[PDB]
Amino acid sequence: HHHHHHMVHITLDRNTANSWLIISKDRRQVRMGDTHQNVSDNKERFSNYPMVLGAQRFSSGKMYWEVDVTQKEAWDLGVCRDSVQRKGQFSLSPENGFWTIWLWQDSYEAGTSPQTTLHIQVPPCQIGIFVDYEAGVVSFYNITDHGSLIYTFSECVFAGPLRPFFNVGFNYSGGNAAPLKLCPL
Ligand SMILES: NC(=S)Nc1ccccc1OC(F)(F)F
């Protein structure tokens, strides 16, 4: 791909974070803490899952960013509507306002309903995310494998402003403590 030149500087929005997340000073890294992180509750926080949004809102144009997933066992990445549900149980689907991929139990899947199996030969350590608002496209790239395509959502019906979306995953196994990191341009 030649999407790198639409690079945007993403930062994480603390106010949206699940109360167990720890976001770095520079707002570019996030990990699962081993307890509640001593913050007040608010209507923006994701309650049920270790999720957080980017601060940036996109309603036009082309945007690109990269995320480091090194030595994680589980995570979700992509974009979502600004108005997605925060409280309770929900599935990651375009019907619910999410355009995402994930790693879970040694398989990669796109968050369609029902989910779609991904075919990745080189497990990625960094993922590129490209959004073309006007075209209705969200694409994912394997930066570890020379930028190879992972998945494209097309004919997207965004129906609102978009925010970068992250899930660091639970750490029941003790093998998923590593952070998500926004990579430098
Ligand atoms: N709120 C729920 S249902 N679970 C949850 C979410 C975020 C951090 C911790 C959580 O409970 C757990 F520790 F049991 F997983």
Task: Break the chain into its structural domains and give their ranges.
Answer: 4-174
Does the domain at 4-174 match CATH 2.60.120.920? Answer given as yes
Residue 97 CA to chain centroid, in angstroms?
13
Measure 52 CA to ligand 1 centroid, in angstroms: 14
Residue 24 CA to chain centroid, in angstroms?
17
**Determination technique for this PDB entry?**
X-ray
Alpha-carbon span 149 to 56, nearest angstrom = 24
Q: How far is CA 45 from CA 15, 54, 89, 97, in A?
A: 6, 13, 13, 16
Tokens of 77: 């990445």
Which amino acid, residue 148? Answer: S
Compute the radius of gyration of the chain from its Cα atoms: 15
Alpha-carbon span 120 to 25, nearest angstrom = 33
Question: How many CA atoms lie within 13 Å of 97's alpha carbon, on the beta-carbon side?
Answer: 15
Residue 179 CA to chain centroid, in angstroms?
12
Please give all residues whose beta carbon lies within 6 A of any atom in ligand 1, as ranges. Answer: 18, 20, 47-48, 50, 170
Peptide bond into 114 cis (omega under 30): yes
Contact in structure between 33 and 171 (CB atoms under 8 Å): no
Most distant pair of Cα atoms in the chain: their distance: 43
Q: Which of 47, 52, 86, 171 to mutate to test the pocket of ligand 1 (most atoms within 8 A of CB)?
A: 47
Measure 85 CA to ligand 1 centroid, in angstroms: 17
Tokens of 7: 């690079």
Ramachandran area for residue 88 (φ above 0: left; ψ -120 to 50: alpha; else beta): left
Q: What is the end-to-end Cα distance of the chain in Å, rounded?
A: 15
Give the DSSP per-residue string, the chain.
---GGGB----EEGGGS-TTEEE-TTS-EEEE-SS--S----TTS-SSSSEEEES--BSSSEEEEEEE-TT-S-EEEEEEETT---SS----STTTTEEEEEEETTEEEE--SS-EE---SS--SEEEEEEETTTTEEEEEETTTTTEEEEEE-S----S-EEEEEE----SSSS--PPEEEPP-
Alpha-carbon span 8 to 145, nearest angstrom = 22
Residue 98 CA to chain centroid, in angstroms?
10
Q: Which residue has the tokens 């029902």?
A: 114
Which atom, in ligand 1's list, is nearest to the CA of 49?
6
